[PDB]
Amino acid sequence: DSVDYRKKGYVTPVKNQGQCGSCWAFSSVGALEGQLKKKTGKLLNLSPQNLVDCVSENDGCGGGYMTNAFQYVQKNRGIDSEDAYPYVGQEESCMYNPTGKAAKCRGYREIPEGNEKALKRAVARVGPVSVAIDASLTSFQFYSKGVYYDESCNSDNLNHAVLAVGYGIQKGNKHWIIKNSWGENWGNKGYILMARNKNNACGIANLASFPKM
Ligand SMILES: N#Cc1nc(CCCN2CCCCC2)cc(C2CCCCCC2)n1
Resolution in A: 1.5
- List, in sequence order, every residue forming a beta bridge with 209; answer none if it has no partner: 110, 130
Give, as one character, the DSSP assignment of residue 98. Answer: G
**CA 122 to each of CA 34, 59, 128: distance values in angstroms, whole numbers, following the listed order:** 13, 28, 8
Q: What is the dihedral of CA 105, 106, 111, 117, to 10 degrees?
A: -80
- Calpha distance 114→124 (Å, rounded): 17
Domains of the chain, CATH where assigned: 1-213 (3.90.70.10)
Residue 138: what are its φ and ψ, rounded to 5°?
-60, -35
- Calpha distance 52→24 (Å, rounded): 9
Binding-site residues, ligand 1, Cβ < 6 A:
21, 23-24, 62-65, 132, 158-161, 207
Instruction: Tell me the one-letter amino acid at 56.
Output: S
- Calpha distance 148→11 (Å, rounded): 21
Q: Which of 193, 187, 131, 179 is nearest to 159 (CA)?
A: 131
Distance, CA 154 to ligand 1 centroid (Å)? 15
Q: Indicate the burial class of 185 (C-beta count within 10 angstroms; 0-12, 13-18, 19 or more).
A: exposed
What was the structure determination method? X-ray
Q: Indicate the burial class of 57 (C-beta count within 10 angstroms; 0-12, 13-18, 19 or more).
A: exposed
Distance, CA 119 to ligand 1 centroid (Å)? 22
Task: Count other Cβ atoms within 10 Å, centred on residue 188.
Answer: 14
Distance, CA 156 to ligand 1 centroid (Å)? 14
Ligand 1, atom 15: closest residue by C-alpha: 63
Query: What is the DSSP track for 38-97?
Result: HHHS----B-HHHHHHH-TTS-TTB---HHHHHHHHHHHT-EEBTTTS---SS-------
Contact indicator for 96, 72 with CB cutoff of 8 Å: no
- Calpha distance 136→5 (Å, rounded): 26
- Calpha distance 173→153 (Å, rounded): 17
Catalytic residues: 23, 160, 180
Three-state SS for 21? strand
**CA 199 to each of CA 41, 50, 213: distance values in angstroms, whole numbers, following the listed order:** 35, 36, 31
H or E element: which one contains 23? helix 23-40
Most informative mutation of 17, 22, 24 for ligand 1 (most atoms within 8 A of CB): 24
Bridge-based pairing of strands 173-179 and 160-170 is antiparallel
Query: What is the DSSP track for 129-161?
Result: EEEEE---SHHHHT--SSEE--TT--TT---EE
Three-state SS for 24? helix
- Calpha distance 117→129 (Å, rounded): 13
Radius of gyration, alpha carbons of the chain: 16
CA angle 61, 202, 21 (to 5 degrees): 5
